Motif scaffolding. Structure first.
Motif, PDB file in Angstrom:
ATOM      1  N   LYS A   4     -15.999  -3.477   9.029  1.00  0.00           N
ATOM      2  CA  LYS A   4     -16.953  -3.594   7.944  1.00  0.00           C
ATOM      3  C   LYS A   4     -16.166  -3.733   6.652  1.00  0.00           C
ATOM      4  N   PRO A   5     -16.799  -4.207   5.565  1.00  0.00           N
ATOM      5  CA  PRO A   5     -16.096  -4.267   4.277  1.00  0.00           C
ATOM      6  C   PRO A   5     -15.612  -2.920   3.773  1.00  0.00           C
ATOM      7  N   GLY A   6     -14.302  -2.727   3.781  1.00  0.00           N
ATOM      8  CA  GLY A   6     -13.728  -1.467   3.376  1.00  0.00           C
ATOM      9  C   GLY A   6     -12.275  -1.645   3.007  1.00  0.00           C
ATOM     10  N   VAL A   7     -11.616  -0.527   2.749  1.00  0.00           N
ATOM     11  CA  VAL A   7     -10.259  -0.527   2.220  1.00  0.00           C
ATOM     12  C   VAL A   7      -9.282  -0.405   3.379  1.00  0.00           C
ATOM     13  N   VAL A   8      -8.478  -1.439   3.594  1.00  0.00           N
ATOM     14  CA  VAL A   8      -7.350  -1.332   4.513  1.00  0.00           C
ATOM     15  C   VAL A   8      -6.177  -0.717   3.769  1.00  0.00           C
ATOM     16  N   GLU A   9      -5.786   0.480   4.176  1.00  0.00           N
ATOM     17  CA  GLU A   9      -4.704   1.200   3.529  1.00  0.00           C
ATOM     18  C   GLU A   9      -3.424   0.997   4.324  1.00  0.00           C
ATOM     19  N   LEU A  10      -2.428   0.400   3.682  1.00  0.00           N
ATOM     20  CA  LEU A  10      -1.099   0.252   4.252  1.00  0.00           C
ATOM     21  C   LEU A  10      -0.215   1.340   3.663  1.00  0.00           C
ATOM     22  N   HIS A  11       0.386   2.150   4.528  1.00  0.00           N
ATOM     23  CA  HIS A  11       1.294   3.200   4.100  1.00  0.00           C
ATOM     24  C   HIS A  11       2.670   2.958   4.690  1.00  0.00           C
ATOM     25  N   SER A  12       3.695   3.260   3.896  1.00  0.00           N
ATOM     26  CA  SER A  12       5.077   3.276   4.355  1.00  0.00           C
ATOM     27  C   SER A  12       5.705   4.646   4.159  1.00  0.00           C
ATOM     28  N   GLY A  13       4.910   5.639   3.778  1.00  0.00           N
ATOM     29  CA  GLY A  13       5.407   6.935   3.377  1.00  0.00           C
ATOM     30  C   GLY A  13       4.455   7.549   2.372  1.00  0.00           C
ATOM     31  N   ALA A  14       4.973   7.925   1.204  1.00  0.00           N
ATOM     32  CA  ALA A  14       4.100   8.423   0.150  1.00  0.00           C
ATOM     33  C   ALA A  14       3.362   7.302  -0.568  1.00  0.00           C
ATOM     34  N   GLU A  15       3.882   6.079  -0.523  1.00  0.00           N
ATOM     35  CA  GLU A  15       3.309   4.958  -1.256  1.00  0.00           C
ATOM     36  C   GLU A  15       2.267   4.228  -0.416  1.00  0.00           C
ATOM     37  N   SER A  16       1.116   3.967  -1.029  1.00  0.00           N
ATOM     38  CA  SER A  16      -0.025   3.359  -0.364  1.00  0.00           C
ATOM     39  C   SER A  16      -0.492   2.159  -1.171  1.00  0.00           C
ATOM     40  N   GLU A  17      -0.623   1.013  -0.512  1.00  0.00           N
ATOM     41  CA  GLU A  17      -1.233  -0.161  -1.122  1.00  0.00           C
ATOM     42  C   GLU A  17      -2.617  -0.368  -0.518  1.00  0.00           C
ATOM     43  N   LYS A  18      -3.620  -0.449  -1.383  1.00  0.00           N
ATOM     44  CA  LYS A  18      -5.019  -0.418  -0.985  1.00  0.00           C
ATOM     45  C   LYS A  18      -5.606  -1.808  -1.162  1.00  0.00           C
ATOM     46  N   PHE A  19      -5.809  -2.505  -0.049  1.00  0.00           N
ATOM     47  CA  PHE A  19      -6.487  -3.791  -0.032  1.00  0.00           C
ATOM     48  C   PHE A  19      -7.932  -3.564   0.378  1.00  0.00           C
ATOM     49  N   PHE A  20      -8.866  -3.958  -0.476  1.00  0.00           N
ATOM     50  CA  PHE A  20     -10.268  -3.991  -0.095  1.00  0.00           C
ATOM     51  C   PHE A  20     -10.577  -5.356   0.497  1.00  0.00           C
ATOM     52  N   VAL A  21     -11.005  -5.375   1.753  1.00  0.00           N
ATOM     53  CA  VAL A  21     -11.216  -6.615   2.475  1.00  0.00           C
ATOM     54  C   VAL A  21     -12.708  -6.881   2.596  1.00  0.00           C
ATOM     55  N   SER A  22     -13.028  -8.059   3.106  1.00  0.00           N
ATOM     56  CA  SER A  22     -14.394  -8.535   3.245  1.00  0.00           C
ATOM     57  C   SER A  22     -14.962  -8.293   4.630  1.00  0.00           C
ATOM     58  N   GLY A  23     -14.181  -7.717   5.525  1.00  0.00           N
ATOM     59  CA  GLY A  23     -14.559  -7.651   6.915  1.00  0.00           C
ATOM     60  C   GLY A  23     -13.881  -8.741   7.724  1.00  0.00           C
ATOM     61  N   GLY A  24     -13.974  -8.603   9.035  1.00  0.00           N
ATOM     62  CA  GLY A  24     -13.267  -9.483   9.943  1.00  0.00           C
ATOM     63  C   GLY A  24     -12.377  -8.593  10.774  1.00  0.00           C
ATOM     64  N   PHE A  25     -12.029  -9.074  11.954  1.00  0.00           N
ATOM     65  CA  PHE A  25     -11.567  -8.232  13.041  1.00  0.00           C
ATOM     66  C   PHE A  25     -10.139  -7.754  12.813  1.00  0.00           C
ATOM     67  N   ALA A  26      -9.761  -6.735  13.577  1.00  0.00           N
ATOM     68  CA  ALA A  26      -8.419  -6.176  13.523  1.00  0.00           C
ATOM     69  C   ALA A  26      -8.055  -5.709  14.918  1.00  0.00           C
ATOM     70  N   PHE A  27      -7.033  -6.311  15.503  1.00  0.00           N
ATOM     71  CA  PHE A  27      -6.667  -6.046  16.882  1.00  0.00           C
ATOM     72  C   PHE A  27      -5.444  -5.153  16.928  1.00  0.00           C
ATOM     73  N   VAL A  28      -5.402  -4.280  17.923  1.00  0.00           N
ATOM     74  CA  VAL A  28      -4.196  -3.556  18.297  1.00  0.00           C
ATOM     75  C   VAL A  28      -3.888  -3.958  19.728  1.00  0.00           C
ATOM     76  N   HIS A  29      -2.670  -4.396  19.969  1.00  0.00           N
ATOM     77  CA  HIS A  29      -2.287  -4.957  21.254  1.00  0.00           C
ATOM     78  C   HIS A  29      -1.542  -3.915  22.078  1.00  0.00           C
ATOM     79  N   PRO A  30      -1.342  -4.152  23.386  1.00  0.00           N
ATOM     80  CA  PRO A  30      -0.560  -3.193  24.189  1.00  0.00           C
ATOM     81  C   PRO A  30       0.870  -2.978  23.724  1.00  0.00           C
ATOM     82  N   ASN A  31       1.498  -3.960  23.083  1.00  0.00           N
ATOM     83  CA  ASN A  31       2.854  -3.792  22.583  1.00  0.00           C
ATOM     84  C   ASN A  31       2.899  -3.221  21.176  1.00  0.00           C
TER      85      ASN A  31
END
Lengths: 177, 53, 72
Positions: free
Chosen positions: A90-117
């Protein structure tokens, strides 16, 4: 049930019988990807490759350690060796973290896959950083979006998507850290 | 392409159209052919005219 | 009539719904960014069906605003 096991290799072999032989095999989208799903590895502990994509950009491709994805059941998180997932967002904030620092992308929706690898491919259309949205026009537009309520379920479904995206944008812009 | 000084690009695609469209043919499968670009509109009709939509 | 999400039961495809959401996210962007997000929003093309082999009527799109929010 899978009696046509195609691929680049089978199409190469059958295509040398019906096309004229001087024509080189047409390329395939497999030939430009070194990363697959069933190819095990690419994990290396805490950080995992986050392929945050866009039709008009590539917003991230380096390895991150935790990703907050806004699925349609609610916000969930991905650590390294997560379960395989095909999550509609759903339209929400994809939060990318590398540690203490967070970059907040608000997206429009659309799928997100996690693969076996362990590779994660966030795949959204309009993926803005939340810096570049103003807090004024969202309620300014939702006041009109709460007004034009017709019986046209095409326009009413567009109004539902409008009020839900605008409400999520409002609730993500008042709730800054 | 739309403009035409591209130099044998669209004709190479028109020949790979039939080269990959005959390798589908195994049981008499229905095929719709569609062209994006004005220079494919003129070139697929020479080879596949009834299957153009 | 169909059985799916709220866009799918209304006859709408998924791509139209997701582009409608992308358009409504674009319309509220920052002004150093909203004008350059209008470049990735314009729909200018045309189409024409071809029934008998070469005849067919034309259908022209001139849309600078985005995808049509109205019914397809």
């Amino acid at each position: 049930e899978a009696a046509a096991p195609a691929g680049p290799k089978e199409f190469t072999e059958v295509w040398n019988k019906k096309a004229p032989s001087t024509l080189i095999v047409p390329e395939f989208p497999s030939n430009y990807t070194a990363v697959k799903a069933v190819g095990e590895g690419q994990v290396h502990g805490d950080a995992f490759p986050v392929n945050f994509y866009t039709p008009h950009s590539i917003l991230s491709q380096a390895q991150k350690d935790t990703v907050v994805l806004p699925g349609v059941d609610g916000y969930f998180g991905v650590k390294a060796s997560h379960v395989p997932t095909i999550a509609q967002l759903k339209p929400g904030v994809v939060e990318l973290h590398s540690g203490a620092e967070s970059e907040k992308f608000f997206v429009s929706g659309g799928f997100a896959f996690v693969h076996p690898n362990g590779v994660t491919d966030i795949c959204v259309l309009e993926a803005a950083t939340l810096d570049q949205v103003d807090p004024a026009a969202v309620k300014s537009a939702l006041a009109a979006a709460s007004a034009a309520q017709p019986t046209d379920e095409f326009e009413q479904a567009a109004n539902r998507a409008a009020i839900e995206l605008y409400s999520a944008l409002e609730s993500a812009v008042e709730a800054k850290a | 392409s739309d403009k035409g000084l591209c130099g044998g690009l669209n004709s190479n695609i028109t020949k790979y159209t039939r080269a990959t469209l005959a390798t589908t043919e195994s049981e008499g499968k229905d095929v719709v052919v569609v062209s994006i670009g004005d220079k494919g509109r003129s070139q697929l009709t020479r080879i596949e005219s009834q299957r153009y939509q | 009539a169909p059985s799916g999400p709220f866009y799918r039961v209304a006859g709408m495809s998924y791509l139209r719904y997701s582009n409608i959401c992308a358009d409504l996210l674009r319309n509220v962007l920052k002004e150093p960014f909203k004008a350059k997000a209008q470049a990735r929003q314009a729909i200018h093309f045309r189409q024409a069906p071809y029934v008998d082999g070469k005849a067919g009527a034309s259908k022209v799109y001139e849309l600078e605003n985005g995808i049509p929010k109205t019914a397809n």
